[model samples]
Target: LPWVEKYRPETLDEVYGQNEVITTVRKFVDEGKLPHLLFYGPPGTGKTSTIVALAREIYGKNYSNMVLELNASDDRGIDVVRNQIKDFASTRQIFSKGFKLIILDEADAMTNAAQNALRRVIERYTKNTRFCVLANYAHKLTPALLSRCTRFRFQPLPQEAIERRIANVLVHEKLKLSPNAEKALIELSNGDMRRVLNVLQSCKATLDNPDEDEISDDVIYECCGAPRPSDLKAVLKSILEDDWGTAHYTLNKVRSAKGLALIDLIEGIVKILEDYELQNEETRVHLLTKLADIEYSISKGGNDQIQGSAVIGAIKASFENE
Candidate 1:
């Protein structure tokens, strides 16, 4: 089983973070007064999980019956939301007190027209149904819909919170991550608990015997399909400090060896150079901007081989312009 749902938070307190939001929602669910909710924030920060947990709290053994979840990325069209959602929300069918928990994951993907229908649906079934709208960005939602719901922003889980969960999972799975790999897992996760879990699961599966086999940092980086920081630094040192002769050799050397594209190569290069702190702030910005332009060129019908070579020229341009 995927570790994400395998050890999902069962109760509000079991959730990774969001101490205040959890407490507030606990009160509402306790009173059987869960309002139409708007939960908007970064992905995998427990927006969907929180809503699911809330539904279970409200419904108990009959949890599945009361919840009507429609991931908007799949079926966010107006017709589906209107007839399907409105039909379910009707008080004629719904008899229990606050029985309907309509959870719309990725609600921001809903079209303006769909949102219009949704607002009406919410109003029409005000008594029978309560909504939990999950979005990555609140700005995409209409004012009409936003105003009708109580809003809560799900912050990214703190690094401390993420590492704690990872530690627990490692112990349970009996998997071993090397010291550098452990730090890499946390750093790459960037406070999103779900991502760390998923990455760890992938790394575990790749190993012949996760219980005994040690996962190195390189293995983790390879699983993510990203170049290691050491590789990035080595390449950047060759390019920015020396000549393209050496830099070009490095990219050509690892181009096929690592399953990364020229664009990712350029991105990794810029990232490493930025970290080196070799250039002043203003100089770094200019260089990174040129890198972006070249990347754009490569992305839009530009020959990757040619652009791969052009990266050196771009950096040189940044230097000359400075």
Candidate 2:
């Protein structure tokens, strides 16, 4: 089993972060009055976990019969919503009184007509079943459907919560993660616990002696294909100081050596430059704007070589303007 699933939180209390959402939901659980729920937030922030755990606690032994879990991205359309959902919501099992759970994960991926279909089903099935809609972006869901549920926002886990979770994973795996690597992993996670665990597992798999050897920041960077701080510094230094040809060569060397994309390199440069002190604000603004343009071009299938040179050219031009 993947570490992500292996380390999955089985109970609501086991879930880390999003304290307000948890506490409020726990109150609803105890009061036996969980309204139809709409959970929206960034990915891997325990939206799914909280809902699943809630259902588990509520239904206990008949979880399989009481809960219908579906990822809207896969089995979505007006047809599925009308048929699969309606059938599940309408069916009753042996005079059971508790409401059945229908978890619509990735609800943002559902089509417009499907959401419209869902809105009706939610209204019709309010007596016997509860709908739990999970989405990364709430705007994609129609206002009519959004109005039907009590919405909860799941924010990204705090650094301390993430660290504590990582510590638990480390203890179970018997792996020694260096402080720098832990920081790097957390920093790269952008508050997504799933990203942190996935990176950590992949990093562990590459090692010969996982328990004996310590995981370093380089390994973390290498696993995620993120440009290391050292490489970012070198690339920036070359761009600012070296002549065009030499700077171009250095950038390509570091890029290819690290197997990094131009977009990643540009992001790394942006990250480092934020803390760096420059003599002129104009030079900084000029270069940052051009970097954004280059990034956009690359994303739109612009040639890497052209964009690479364009980056160096932009930096030099910014300096020239200064």
| Model 1: per-residue Cα lDDT at residue 217 | 94
Worst 10 residues of 2 by lDDT: 73-82
Candidate 2 lDDT tens digits, 32-146: 8889989998777778778777777777888888899988777345676568888887777686786788998888988787788888888998998888899988988899889
Global Cα lDDT for candidate 1: 0.77
In model 2, which runs have C-alpha deviations exceeding 4 angstroms?
Answer: 22-35, 56-66, 75-82, 93-99, 108-128, 137-150, 320-322
| Best-matching candidate per lDDT | 2
As a TM-score, model 1 comes out at 0.79
TM-score of each: 0.79, 0.82
Candidate 1 lDDT trough over 10 residues, lowest sum: 90-99
Question: Candidate 1 at 171: error in angstroms?
Answer: 0.7
Screening candidate 1 with a backbone cut-off below 3 angstroms (N, C-alpha, C), the clashing residue pairs are: none
lDDT of 1 by residue, 180-248 (tens): 998987877777666788889899889987578899998889887776878766666566667768877
